Write a protein that binds this ligand. Sequence first.
Ligand SMILES: Cn1c2c(c3ccc(Cl)c(Cl)c31)[C@H](C#N)C1(CCNCC1)NC2=O
Ligand SMILES: [K+]
Length: 339
Amino acid sequence: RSVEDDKEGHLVCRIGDWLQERYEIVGNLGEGTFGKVVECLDHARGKSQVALKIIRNVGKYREAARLEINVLKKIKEKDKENKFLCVLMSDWFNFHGHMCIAFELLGKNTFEFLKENNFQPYPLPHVRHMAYQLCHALRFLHENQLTHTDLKPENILFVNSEFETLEKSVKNTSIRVVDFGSATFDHEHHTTIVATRHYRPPEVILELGWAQPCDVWSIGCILFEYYRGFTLFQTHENREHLVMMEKILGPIPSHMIHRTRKQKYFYKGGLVWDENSSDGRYVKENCKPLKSYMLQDSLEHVQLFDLMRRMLEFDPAQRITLAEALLHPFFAGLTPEER
Ligand SMILES: Cn1c2c(c3ccc(Cl)c(Cl)c31)[C@H](C#N)C1(CCNCC1)NC2=O
Ligand SMILES: [K+]
């Protein structure tokens, strides 16, 4: 039956409407300037649960999602045994201008969970299993001329976020990667600024080109966050961010300085920073060498920090690959099953 759009290009629909005389809406799950994501029953797969992404009837959002779908196709094509932890897309159609993409319902994101637990960090066993899934999934993606570009706790969902009480622990540490809306093939237009602030690597800030090494940094940042419960780089300005990195991580390689069109942030090869000034006192207090954030001395932890540091190399050409990461002695600590 006839549908309708609003003054802004959103499909008009609430809980109880159908699309394709197949999908029944029964929940709201997310919204934005892309459109809606609604829970549905696939009344042509015995009423099984789906997340349906419904995109605004607008040129740029609709073309953005043409590519989102190409990526999901490539993935489904490559991960037949269903083993590479990237979200399965079950369906996709152009509904009266609106692109819709259905996926398997999943549970809470690793951000929602963390904040529902008062920002106390995941045990290290959990950190290890999730780091492993993440390394496993994006390696798959990277041997397929793809880069995700927007990895963060919000974009990683528990299959099943049922928790126990202790302070909360997730019964099941299985996660999916999600939101391939930003993912770029090696051969296609690289958007310049990419990733959300906290998870953004230096070669992007310095506008020096990016590729797969972009996602590895994102992961290094995310693991720090799983391990401490709080972000590595708590800033919203490019100059402070580069200074925090240097204070947490070490001196930027001078070749990356020689090369960046972002000269404004540098004088005679040094970053411009007022140590003795409001923002100074704060970063001096708070931004410390990576090894300082270790919460215990034991091996598992040292093994973790070596991976994080390798994931957080300034020179993207130097940074660890995820194929390398998979062999790291941090991942000798894994059970048979967790393997
Ligand atoms: C709850 N949720 C959401 C998405 C999902 C994609 C797949 C699945 Cl199975 C779920 Cl449950 C999702 C969307 C995507 N991609 C995003 C869109 C941007 N942030 C990441 C998830 N928002 C959701 O509400
Ligand atoms: K923020």
